Amino acid sequence: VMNRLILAMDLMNRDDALRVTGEVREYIDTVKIGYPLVLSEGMDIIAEFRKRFGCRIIADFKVADIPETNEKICRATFKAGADAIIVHGFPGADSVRACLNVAEEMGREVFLLTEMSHPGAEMFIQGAADEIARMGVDLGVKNYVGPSTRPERLSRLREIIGQDSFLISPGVGAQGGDPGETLRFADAIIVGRSIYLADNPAAAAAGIIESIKDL
Amino acid sequence: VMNRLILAMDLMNRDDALRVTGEVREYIDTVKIGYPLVLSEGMDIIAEFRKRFGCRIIADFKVADIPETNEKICRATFKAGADAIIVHGFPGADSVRACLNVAEEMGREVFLLTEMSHPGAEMFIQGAADEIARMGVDLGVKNYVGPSTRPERLSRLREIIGQDSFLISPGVGAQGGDPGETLRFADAIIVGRSIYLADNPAAAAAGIIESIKDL
Ligand SMILES: Cc1cc(=O)[nH]c(=O)n1[C@@H]1O[C@H](COP(=O)(O)O)[C@@H](O)[C@H]1O
């Protein structure tokens, strides 16, 4: 990922989302698009962004259903042009395998979300996260998401998945995570509001990149 | 819910989804619409169904993000005309509260998914399910989802939530659950493929209702 920075584009208006993404395009080459934008503007927004910006698109859909439904969700998401999809591991191995099967059929990638970044993640997810990660390894998952807000947990996730696996990390900026510390363990950081709510998103992205190059 | 039966409309084509829903409308008055249909046909499908069929719509979006994103997802879903949304409890109390806050602002309902119906649910979700349910009670959740495939677990969920709470249950038919047994504990059953993949969906729905009235 260009500059190890992934934009979390969670504005809910097509015009604002296009404006911000265009302003920061030189600093990124991967955009994470989730349900706030998709449920407001339609799945066609994925192919529009892919074309206009020539970026890779990660669909952050936190897929968390039974295996049969997960297959349908993944098929629709890849048909819409997403390069990868984020999948929850908490629903278990069969649900993750269903997503892996569709990604294999369509030449795409799955990212497994193993521990979340918000405070509530401590209640149930944290205590399962190591086992969710190990499940990922045993299923052959190569791409993972873990939390910038808890770098000791990010270190433990990296320990389980090994150095060859790709690890991206949200919670930088707004949720309190630090870019440099997070990049001790993650390959790339995800940043949303610290960029897209800034008075000058390009200057915000540049500031982050400047602190990244210093590592 | 009319006849204690909720149609899980997970066909991915608007014409087929409209045909089946129209054929079974006399047997139901609540349609559950999820991401297979929404990500294939757009969020506008919710208002279309609500109008054409005069049904209640439950958006089965298994909301499972951080609190800030959950608020955006719920706002977009209610703006699209959904009467209620299904929310995962596994991400913790703050994530569930975010959904409850938006439902309160917009005069809608949250259904909390506490234990899932597929085999993988045994790995991580089952061991947290009682505590997820108790969390729901403490947050004031009044609507719950639990698994037809494990009626002993459905009984335990009913025990925690009490008789006044509303409980709906998927996994009937295709996944192996039984309508009558499930309705010992749930107020309503969700049925998808046993109806929408049948040669005659109306006859399939009628058959289920006939076995329900017998209780
Ligand atoms: C992928 C994900 C997992 C998670 O544990 N935490 C998280 O924030 N996310 C998403 O990353 C983005 C974080 O954005 P900011 O906090 O930087 O605004 C939002 O899209 C969240 O939904």
Ligand SMILES: Cc1cc(=O)[nH]c(=O)n1[C@@H]1O[C@H](COP(=O)(O)O)[C@@H](O)[C@H]1O
């Ligand atoms: C709500 C939900 C939770 C869950 O634990 N199990 C489940 O099947 N679902 C959904 O119910 C429906 C079950 O459909 P059939 O198995 O009856 O086809 C699908 O939409 C599933 O995504």
